[PDB]
Coordinates of C-alpha atoms in Angstrom, one line a residue:
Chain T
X1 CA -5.9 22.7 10.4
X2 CA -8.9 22.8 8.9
X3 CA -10.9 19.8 7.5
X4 CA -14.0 19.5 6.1
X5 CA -15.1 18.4 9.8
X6 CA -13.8 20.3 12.7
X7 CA -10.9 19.0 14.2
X8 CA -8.0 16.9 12.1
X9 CA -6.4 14.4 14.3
X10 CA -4.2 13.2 11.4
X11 CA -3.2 9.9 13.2
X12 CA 0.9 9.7 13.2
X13 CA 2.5 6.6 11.5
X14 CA 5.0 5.2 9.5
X15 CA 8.4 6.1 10.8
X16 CA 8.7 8.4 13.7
X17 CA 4.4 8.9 13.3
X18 CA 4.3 11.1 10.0
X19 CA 2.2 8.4 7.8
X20 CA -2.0 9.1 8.7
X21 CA -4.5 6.5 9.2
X22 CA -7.2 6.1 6.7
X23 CA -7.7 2.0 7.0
X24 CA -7.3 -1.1 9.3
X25 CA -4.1 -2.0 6.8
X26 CA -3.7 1.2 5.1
X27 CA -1.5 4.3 6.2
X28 CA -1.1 6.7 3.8
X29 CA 1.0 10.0 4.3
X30 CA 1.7 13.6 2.3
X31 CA 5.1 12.5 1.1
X32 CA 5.0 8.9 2.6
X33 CA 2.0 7.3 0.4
X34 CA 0.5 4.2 1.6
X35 CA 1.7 1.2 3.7
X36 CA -1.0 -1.1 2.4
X37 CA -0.8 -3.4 5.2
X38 CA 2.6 -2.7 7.0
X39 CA 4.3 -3.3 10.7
X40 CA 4.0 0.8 9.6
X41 CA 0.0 0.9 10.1
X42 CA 0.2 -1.8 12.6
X43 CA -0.7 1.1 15.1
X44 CA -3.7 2.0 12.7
X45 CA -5.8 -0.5 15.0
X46 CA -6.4 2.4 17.3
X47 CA -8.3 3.8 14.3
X48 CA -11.5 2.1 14.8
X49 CA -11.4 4.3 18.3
X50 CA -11.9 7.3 16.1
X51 CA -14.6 7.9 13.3
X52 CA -13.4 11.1 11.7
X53 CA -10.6 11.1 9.4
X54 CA -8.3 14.1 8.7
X55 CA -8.9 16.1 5.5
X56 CA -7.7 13.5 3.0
X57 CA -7.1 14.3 -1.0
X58 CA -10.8 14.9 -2.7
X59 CA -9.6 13.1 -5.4
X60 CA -12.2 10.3 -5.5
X61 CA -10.9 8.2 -8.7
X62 CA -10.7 5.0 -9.0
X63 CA -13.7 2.7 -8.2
X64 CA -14.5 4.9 -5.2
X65 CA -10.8 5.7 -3.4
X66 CA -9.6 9.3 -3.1
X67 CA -6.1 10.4 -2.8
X68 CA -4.5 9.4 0.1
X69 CA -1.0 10.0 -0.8
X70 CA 1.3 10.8 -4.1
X71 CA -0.1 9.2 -7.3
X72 CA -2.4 6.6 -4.9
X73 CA -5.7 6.5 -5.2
X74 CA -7.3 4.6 -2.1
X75 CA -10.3 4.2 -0.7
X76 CA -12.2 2.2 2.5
X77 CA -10.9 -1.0 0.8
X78 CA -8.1 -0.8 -1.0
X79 CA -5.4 1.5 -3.0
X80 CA -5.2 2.0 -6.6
X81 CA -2.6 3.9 -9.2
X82 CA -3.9 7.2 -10.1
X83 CA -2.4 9.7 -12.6
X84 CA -3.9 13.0 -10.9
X85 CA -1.5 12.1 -8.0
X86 CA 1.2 11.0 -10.3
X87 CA 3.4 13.7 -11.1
X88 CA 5.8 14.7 -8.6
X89 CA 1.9 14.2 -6.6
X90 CA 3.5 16.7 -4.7
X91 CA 4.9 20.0 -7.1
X92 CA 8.6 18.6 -7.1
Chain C
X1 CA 12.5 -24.6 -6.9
X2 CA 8.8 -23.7 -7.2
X3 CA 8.8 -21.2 -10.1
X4 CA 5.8 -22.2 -12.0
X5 CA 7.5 -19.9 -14.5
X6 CA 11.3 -20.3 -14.6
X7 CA 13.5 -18.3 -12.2
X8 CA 11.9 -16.1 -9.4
X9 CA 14.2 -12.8 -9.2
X10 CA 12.5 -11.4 -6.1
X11 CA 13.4 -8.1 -6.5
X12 CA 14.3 -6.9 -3.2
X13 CA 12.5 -3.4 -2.1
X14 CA 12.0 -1.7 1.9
X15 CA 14.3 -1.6 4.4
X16 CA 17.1 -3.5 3.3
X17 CA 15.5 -5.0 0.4
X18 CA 13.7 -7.3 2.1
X19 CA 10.2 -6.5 -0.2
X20 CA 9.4 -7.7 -3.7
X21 CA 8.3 -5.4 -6.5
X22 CA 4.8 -6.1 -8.1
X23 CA 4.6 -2.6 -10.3
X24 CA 5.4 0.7 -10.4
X25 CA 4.1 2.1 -6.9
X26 CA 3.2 -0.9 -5.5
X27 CA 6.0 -3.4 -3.6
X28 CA 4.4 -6.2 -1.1
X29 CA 6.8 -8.6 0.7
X30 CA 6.1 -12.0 2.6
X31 CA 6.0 -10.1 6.2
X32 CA 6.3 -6.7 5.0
X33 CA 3.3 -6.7 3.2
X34 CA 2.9 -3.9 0.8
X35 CA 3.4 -0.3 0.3
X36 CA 1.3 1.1 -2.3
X37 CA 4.1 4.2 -3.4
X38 CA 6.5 4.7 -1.1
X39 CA 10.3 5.8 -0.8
X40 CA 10.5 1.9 -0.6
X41 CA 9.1 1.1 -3.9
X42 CA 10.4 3.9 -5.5
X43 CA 13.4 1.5 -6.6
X44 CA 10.9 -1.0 -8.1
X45 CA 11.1 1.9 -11.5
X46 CA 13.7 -0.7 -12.7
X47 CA 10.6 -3.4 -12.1
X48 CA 9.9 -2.1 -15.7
X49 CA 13.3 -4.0 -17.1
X50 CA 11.7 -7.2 -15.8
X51 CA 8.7 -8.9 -17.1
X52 CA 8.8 -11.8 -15.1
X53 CA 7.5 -11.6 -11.1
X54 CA 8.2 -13.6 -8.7
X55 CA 6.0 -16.7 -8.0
X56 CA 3.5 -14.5 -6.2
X57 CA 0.6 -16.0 -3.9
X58 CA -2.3 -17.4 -6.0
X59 CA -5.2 -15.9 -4.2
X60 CA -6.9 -13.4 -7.0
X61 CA -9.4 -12.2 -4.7
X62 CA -11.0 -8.8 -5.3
X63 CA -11.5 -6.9 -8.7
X64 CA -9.2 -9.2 -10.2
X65 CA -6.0 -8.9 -7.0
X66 CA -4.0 -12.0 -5.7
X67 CA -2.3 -12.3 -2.2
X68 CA 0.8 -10.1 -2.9
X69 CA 1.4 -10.1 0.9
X70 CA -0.2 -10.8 4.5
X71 CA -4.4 -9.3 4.0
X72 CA -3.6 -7.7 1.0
X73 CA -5.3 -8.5 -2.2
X74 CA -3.3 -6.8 -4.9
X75 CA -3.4 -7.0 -8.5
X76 CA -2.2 -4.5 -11.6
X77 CA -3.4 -1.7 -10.5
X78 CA -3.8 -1.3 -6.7
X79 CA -4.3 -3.3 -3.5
X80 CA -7.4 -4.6 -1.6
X81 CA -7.8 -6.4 1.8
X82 CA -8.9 -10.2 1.6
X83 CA -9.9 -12.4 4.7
X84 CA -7.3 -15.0 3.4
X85 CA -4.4 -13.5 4.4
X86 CA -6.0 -11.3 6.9
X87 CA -5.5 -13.9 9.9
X88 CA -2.1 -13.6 11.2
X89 CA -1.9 -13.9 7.3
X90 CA 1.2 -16.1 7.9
X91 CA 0.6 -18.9 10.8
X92 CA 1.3 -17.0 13.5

């Protein structure tokens, strides 16, 4: 719960629908990173049905992309490497 | 074969190894696209013993990414979409 919004509908993908949707090609998850582009995020198309995002790592690094999963810094375009979400991103 | 190098060792990443490995969190295949850190690429770590990538599609789009897979423009660093291999990026 809770999102700088008011409701988190934290779009389920990956396998089984654990990923979120952040992207047309990229689905990034807590422990499942990002699908940059992926059969995965396929269902992600559904995502232009629904403007508000869920939460998401306020890590904006990078040339404008946030953390969107462990040690991935993505944003509305693309991903990128990022050391703040490196480490065991999560704590081990 | 075209190696405009010498010998492609597509390292095989995802399910079943199917993917190739382009850096440390970032594996892209010919249909499987790419995930940007994932459980798939985690065996790409051994990416590091190779300096030599596989072919790779010439389309440095982007800040500087080529075509790694279907609508993704990824280079050292992260992943971007392009239009060129947005379109069924494969022919259909």
């Amino acid at each position: 719960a809770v999102l700088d919004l008011d409701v988190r509908t934290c779009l389920p993908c990956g396998p089984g629908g654990k990923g979120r949707c952040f992207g047309p090609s990229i689905c990034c998850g807590d422990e499942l990173g990002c699908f940059v582009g992926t059969a995965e995020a396929l269902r992600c198309q559904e995502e232009n049905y629904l403007p508000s995002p869920c939460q998401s790592g306020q890590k904006p690094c990078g040339s404008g992309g946030r953390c969107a999963a462990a040690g991935i810094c993505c944003s509305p375009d693309g991903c990128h490497e990022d050391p703040a979400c490196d480490p065991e991103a999560a704590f081990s």
